[PDB]
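Subject: complex prediction, re-run

Hi both,

The earlier run crashed halfway through, so I resubmitted it with identical inputs.
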Amino acid sequence: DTICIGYHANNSTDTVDTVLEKNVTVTHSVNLLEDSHNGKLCRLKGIAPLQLGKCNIAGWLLGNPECDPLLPVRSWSYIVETPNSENGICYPGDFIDYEELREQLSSVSSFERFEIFPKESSWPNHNTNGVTAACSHEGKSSFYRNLLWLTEKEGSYPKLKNSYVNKKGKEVLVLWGIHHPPNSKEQQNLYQNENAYVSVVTSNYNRRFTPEIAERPKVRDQAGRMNYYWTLLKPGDTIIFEANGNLIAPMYAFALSRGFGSGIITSNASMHECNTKCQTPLGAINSSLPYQNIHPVTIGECPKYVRSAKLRMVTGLRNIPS
Amino acid sequence: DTICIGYHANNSTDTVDTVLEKNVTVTHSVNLLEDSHNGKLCRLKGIAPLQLGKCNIAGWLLGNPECDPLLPVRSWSYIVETPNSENGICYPGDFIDYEELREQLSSVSSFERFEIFPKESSWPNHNTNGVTAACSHEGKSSFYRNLLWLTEKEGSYPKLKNSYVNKKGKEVLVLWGIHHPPNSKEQQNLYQNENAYVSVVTSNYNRRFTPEIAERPKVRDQAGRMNYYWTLLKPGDTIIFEANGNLIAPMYAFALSRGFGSGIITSNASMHECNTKCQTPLGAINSSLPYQNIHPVTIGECPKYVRSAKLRMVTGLRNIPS
Amino acid sequence: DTICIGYHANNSTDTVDTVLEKNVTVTHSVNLLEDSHNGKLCRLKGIAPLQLGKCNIAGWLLGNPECDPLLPVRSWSYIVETPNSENGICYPGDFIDYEELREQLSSVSSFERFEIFPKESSWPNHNTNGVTAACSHEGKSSFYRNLLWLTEKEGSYPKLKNSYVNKKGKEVLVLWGIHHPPNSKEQQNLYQNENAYVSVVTSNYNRRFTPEIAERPKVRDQAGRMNYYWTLLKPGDTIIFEANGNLIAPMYAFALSRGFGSGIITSNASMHECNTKCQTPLGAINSSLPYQNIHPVTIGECPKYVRSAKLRMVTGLRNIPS
Amino acid sequence: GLFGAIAGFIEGGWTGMIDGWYGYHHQNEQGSGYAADQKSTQNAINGITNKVNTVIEKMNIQFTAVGKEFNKLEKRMENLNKKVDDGFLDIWTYNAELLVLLENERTLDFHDSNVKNLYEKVKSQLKNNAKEIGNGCFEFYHKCDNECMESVRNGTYDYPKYSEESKLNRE
Amino acid sequence: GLFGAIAGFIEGGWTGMIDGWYGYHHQNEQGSGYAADQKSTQNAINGITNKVNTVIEKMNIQFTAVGKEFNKLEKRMENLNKKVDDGFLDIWTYNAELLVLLENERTLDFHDSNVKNLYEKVKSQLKNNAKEIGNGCFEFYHKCDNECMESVRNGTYDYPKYSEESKLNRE
Amino acid sequence: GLFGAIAGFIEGGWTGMIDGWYGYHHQNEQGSGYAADQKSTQNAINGITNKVNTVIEKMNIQFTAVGKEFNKLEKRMENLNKKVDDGFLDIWTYNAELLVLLENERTLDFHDSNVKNLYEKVKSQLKNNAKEIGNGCFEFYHKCDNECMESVRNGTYDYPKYSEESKLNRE
Ligand SMILES: *[C@@H]1O[C@H](CO)[C@@H](O[C@@H]2O[C@H](CO)[C@@H](O[C@@H]3O[C@H](CO)[C@@H](O)[C@H](O)[C@@H]3O)[C@H](O)[C@H]2NC(C)=O)[C@H](O)[C@H]1NC(C)=O
Ligand SMILES: *[C@@H]1O[C@H](CO)[C@@H](O[C@@H]2O[C@H](CO)[C@@H](O[C@@H]3O[C@H](CO)[C@@H](O)[C@H](O)[C@@H]3O)[C@H](O)[C@H]2NC(C)=O)[C@H](O)[C@H]1NC(C)=O
Ligand SMILES: *[C@@H]1O[C@H](CO)[C@@H](O[C@@H]2O[C@H](CO)[C@@H](O[C@@H]3O[C@H](CO)[C@@H](O)[C@H](O)[C@@H]3O)[C@H](O)[C@H]2NC(C)=O)[C@H](O)[C@H]1NC(C)=O
Ligand SMILES: CN(C)[C@@H]1CCN([S@@](=O)(F)=Nc2ccc(C(=O)N3CCO[C@@H](c4ccccc4)C3)c(Cl)c2)C1
Ligand SMILES: CN(C)[C@@H]1CCN([S@@](=O)(F)=Nc2ccc(C(=O)N3CCO[C@@H](c4ccccc4)C3)c(Cl)c2)C1
Ligand SMILES: CN(C)[C@@H]1CCN([S@@](=O)(F)=Nc2ccc(C(=O)N3CCO[C@@H](c4ccccc4)C3)c(Cl)c2)C1
Ligand SMILES: *[C@@H]1O[C@H](CO)[C@@H](O[C@@H]2O[C@H](CO)[C@@H](O)[C@H](O)[C@H]2NC(C)=O)[C@H](O)[C@H]1NC(C)=O
Ligand SMILES: *[C@@H]1O[C@H](CO)[C@@H](O[C@@H]2O[C@H](CO)[C@@H](O)[C@H](O)[C@H]2NC(C)=O)[C@H](O)[C@H]1NC(C)=O
Ligand SMILES: *[C@@H]1O[C@H](CO)[C@@H](O[C@@H]2O[C@H](CO)[C@@H](O)[C@H](O)[C@H]2NC(C)=O)[C@H](O)[C@H]1NC(C)=O
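This time it finished cleanly. Structure:
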């Protein structure tokens, strides 16, 4: 009569690595590395993202005519920019503090696009139908949907002066532009003033702009330049616009709501009827694993990104079924 | 006759955690996590801190009239700002590179407040008693203690020009301001010049300022603005002030000494007759433990901050007294 | 008859440390910490570095006359600045975005110094032999090799206007300067215009400069100032210079090639006929060890820098030869 | 292994034992069969489950983390942001890979210890009533039925009951 | 435990042994008492003290570390500074918690090893002059006085002295 | 050590054994000599070599890493860059020093385990044909020539061959 002490074996072919030995076949093991995604853009915590389509952030905020207009009010969980965002700024120039504006948008969860200076009621003594071929729409010359190109009316450009009081209870993002003609002949033709200036003031913003006239290399067939500026108008505060020329005036502004967990990503993936807790530019992750090797850019509650190809922890024994 | 091998047991109820098992009762253990503080502001390495009281950094440096004046010379180990620092800039405007100035102050261990441009000897052809209701003191209109509001004298504002040579052997921090009236009528009334300018130059600083006149929303009942500027005058160097208007001239400057281990903290704790090697905004730490979970902000030689609630290392055995 | 089980011992005196015990003598051990260097500057991956000699980055780019001129085309693997770089900017002023320029140079592997505006063909109506004692060469007054001090010719300074089209297929770095005389008398003498201006434009660069006249403390015996500016001209783009005074015009520009693994270091070590895969400011490292304690600044493929004095892993047994 | 049982003096495992990590195989006149030791297997399961949970618990949830944008004149900030992102990724990849490798080695030694301790428990109970025949097996010097076998699998083997018969057969 | 002594074949500890971590309890005609093994206890104390000192030593002194301020147009820098501060805190909390957990497990196994090694030292000295009666106790086959007991507690037990008497009682 | 063999019941090492980490010393009428156990030594060499390679492998190649420059108005960025560089250096120095210390302890215990397991392999083969005389040595109760010694060094010792002669000498 005999009794023997022994241990379990099975047909498992899982392998793990140790400090002393690689490629150890074990009876049971647990994978800790998430490598699977669904390849789709999904709602995050039940909230759909904001897709800008052919527009980048600059094109959407300025109102590039070649992008499908969005609904007046949108709410989102993250922002998607398509990799080949050909529609952005259409009239050449510099977007001052543009990267800072993107960082502000990354913590925004909603916008309301509203008319801050009505087109047919705010500029009675000025011309408001200025368009350019650099911002074409359907082959025709056009302009930004959210801005107004003011020019002289009846051979006169009176000193304009308009203000807005923020009664929305939320931050209002105001965008405007300054045009710099390539020669003094055009400056007199458009604005009738050579010593022109623009003044924009709030309780915490105070800047003055002056045209700088010079001939420049053509960009999108424009020797002129248009510099774009922005500021966040606090609840209850007033913004005052003062100019005798060169002002690309605001028409529409955005009332912004602040949220958490949002951001801006670049992806060519398509939106789908799905929900996830973790979104990457390549796809969504449905996993409770501590690590993932899919993408370093994540939205939501996600596994930690690592460079590893395999993270398998042994739970069972060394497998010796011989 | 028998002999037995055994191990120690006692009445200890200390518990530790392991990889394989939680809540293991052990005979002896060592706590590594510091969680106790005295709740007071203390001297650090025998040096008392600098408490700004109701003033923030900007209010103290400009000389806000509503803060108790400090002694001409102070030395400190860290700087304390009270959370509700209602006294800062009193005349509305922008403090240029203010955050950079705070970072400079964080490595400063001493100041000497001295008269750089004497009030009754430096501006013989200018008016020097300008005060504002925005910087009130005891209900009366006043002005910054360290600055001088220059205005026209006898209907004239001559081009002023003054210089200072740094013979202190230490960096001298010079602060000044530029006033921007809300309309051209006030600009002529105060400074008699509409094409006014201010010039401030040293061997490594070179800036020119020009008033930008526009009506603005009232801040502290002021439509005007006052922009504040600073520079660090190196030992032996000269600073030259040149203006024909709008200059808020320096009166007092600070000779600064550089130290190590200092910083700026926010705390509502009170100063006490105590000494410590480690100070936090919540209180002082007297500990030789490697970790603490009291506050991430520390002054001196401190345990490393972690988020953990418990860090107990077992030294003795598993406790089985049954 | 007997048989015994035992283990190896030898005369080794290597010692290692453990968690429970320090200074354990072991039979075999492996050092993981690299502490040896050759004390020389070497070629990295077969490419010699760029040594600036007595010049710093600013002196080399501007063309300080006191530095030995380099060959028209150079390629390198890293850039060496000597600690006492006495030759830099020789005419006092500010180098705008100088630190950004250094960061750009850190990813550059080659330059071609070429004539962008020929000296005797680009400025027919202007004077081009301006020199200063602040940029002396061989005791005689001189000027930067890459720039031209334009002044009035025959009591006239006509509005100059010149452009360059980048046909090199690589980024072209263009440097220029703006002179600020200390008084209006000199401004009229040099440039005949008091309301002078300089305009520099490309497809993505657009800046206008205006002299700011004031007397200033003497730096290198100069009350005047010279501000230096730069921009990277993209392949195919045009740069246009427009001025009626105060322009320190470009003469030579650099066509730049982009590389990887390069950087700027400070060292007093000498170049030698050697090759290495890892270069430090103190010397080259020839090692396959994972760690080094020689210097935190490394070029190439290097061991990771740590503060440790000893990192020895035991491979053999505890050595008990008694 | 560190304790010499798994792939040691017990050369191989048992595919026939499906209900536990460690156990016994017996052979007497009533037959033979495998029997997992439920106490040691369940204790090991609890410890291993806790080890995996600890590894997952120590890794915090990664909340939203996206990139930033920088203009042509902010190369230094862009390189510093890249240096921060690269450095953190280096450490976490290093931390994760090492932790799995180190815990994998400890897990195998933990199972090795349990087999050895189980073997020593039986050896101390049987004493000289059985003989070690290698490969982790014992040959009894007396008849041991299913009831006797169960007294070995649990902690209640009666040594004095069989000492006389074992002594005669041990001779 | 890994070595099977603490909470193993020695089920519980001794509150009556106050002067050391490991030791002996003896019983003969002269009486009984506890006696801590000073050599193993002191060696363990030295090793454990060194382990705690190493943990403290490896953590550098945290010098002054305060926050920074940023204006409304420096959000990216403020978020990068926050990302750096958060990331370092994540790693150090992770490093500290794991180190204590891992060293705690090793400490318990270290004590378990010392008990087992002490037990094996006595077993090898006594050989067949005593019998294992479980729970880490030995019953002598001969009279063992206080002098004989002390020769077991230190390394000088005289096996040939009692072999003849033990053989008769072992029978 | 954790397993009690090195600097334990085997007090010291052998300078005379040059060809391996562990082995045997024999003494019979034909003479004496050292003989390294090639199987355990080579297996340990493979494991240790893999441990060192893993330590080197886990550390990535440090590519180019130089400092940055900042003007007088970028103190905050300069301090943040310094904070990042200091923090990473703190962690890697901490990671490197701890890893060597922890792996050093495991390496010594690994060698200690191999000596103990080798000793137990011989003890199980010899059974009662030899006697433990301390210091990791066995005295045979029978004549054991070089062929008999080699059957012990490898796994093929013939216990039944010498049981009768050993019993007479054991008496
Ligand atoms: C890691 O371990 C696995 C499993 O132990 C290794 O895979 C195995 O490799 C061996 C030979 O390298 C294969 O054995 C061969 O099988 C064929 C067909 O049965 C036979 O003709 C040969 O004579 C030999 O016996 C074995 O099938 C294979 N097992 C698998 C793939 O499941 C693997 O090579 C090890 N190394 C690495 C780097 O993965
Ligand atoms: C961690 O371990 C401690 C100590 O082992 C646990 O605390 C203990 O919990 C048990 C029951 O959960 C208590 O036993 C009970 O005592 C009462 C009164 O003596 C008796 O009426 C019950 O029948 C039972 O025996 C024990 O007193 C208590 N010891 C303490 C608090 O020191 C603890 O629950 C474990 N778990 C955690 C998460 O802490
Ligand atoms: C670490 O371990 C080493 C080696 O074990 C220690 O060095 C040794 O130190 C001892 C005394 O501290 C020296 O022994 C002395 O030797 C002299 C001359 O032979 C003799 O006159 C004395 O009576 C005593 O025996 C021994 O030579 C020396 N071995 C060396 C240096 O190789 C060392 O002290 C330990 N501690 C540290 C912190 O390194
Ligand atoms: C988010 N994931 C990663 C989760 C988070 C929580 N778990 S979990 O920690 F429970 N994982 C496992 C996964 C597998 C095992 C395991 O080895 N066996 C399960 C129990 O029966 C064992 C057995 C023994 C003998 C014969 C047959 C079967 C096999 C263990 Cl012990 C724990 C993982
Ligand atoms: C800055 N702090 C954290 C310091 C830094 C340095 N220490 S230290 O490393 F010495 N800590 C300890 C704290 C406690 C112990 C310990 O278990 N016993 C002390 C010695 O007698 C032991 C004993 C055994 C049997 C019966 C009664 C008593 C109990 C040890 Cl071994 C080390 C901590
Ligand atoms: C880039 N470096 C750091 C490289 C990267 C790869 N190696 S490596 O891992 F192979 N290092 C070593 C270095 C030394 C050893 C070792 O202990 N012995 C070598 C084999 O014979 C052993 C012996 C035993 C008994 C008597 C005499 C001799 C001694 C080992 Cl096992 C590995 C290091
Ligand atoms: C351990 O196993 C033994 C089997 O030999 C159990 O002892 C028997 O238990 C049954 C219960 O149905 C009784 O009828 C027998 O009389 C017992 N045998 C003897 C010799 O008394 C024992 O109960 C088990 N112990 C446990 C499970 O804790
Ligand atoms: C180990 O303990 C034994 C106790 O049996 C010690 O041996 C005795 O030591 C005393 C010293 O006072 C002598 O008088 C006795 O004659 C010794 N006994 C015998 C049988 O010779 C022994 O010295 C101890 N060894 C140590 C402490 O190293
Ligand atoms: C283990 O060692 C023994 C030595 O006793 C080897 O057995 C002998 O091998 C030789 C081969 O030349 C034969 O001539 C002898 O007849 C063998 N001895 C007996 C008693 O049969 C054995 O081969 C070795 N096993 C190995 C190396 O695997």
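The CA atoms of residues 6 and 141 of chain F lie 27 Å apart.

- K.
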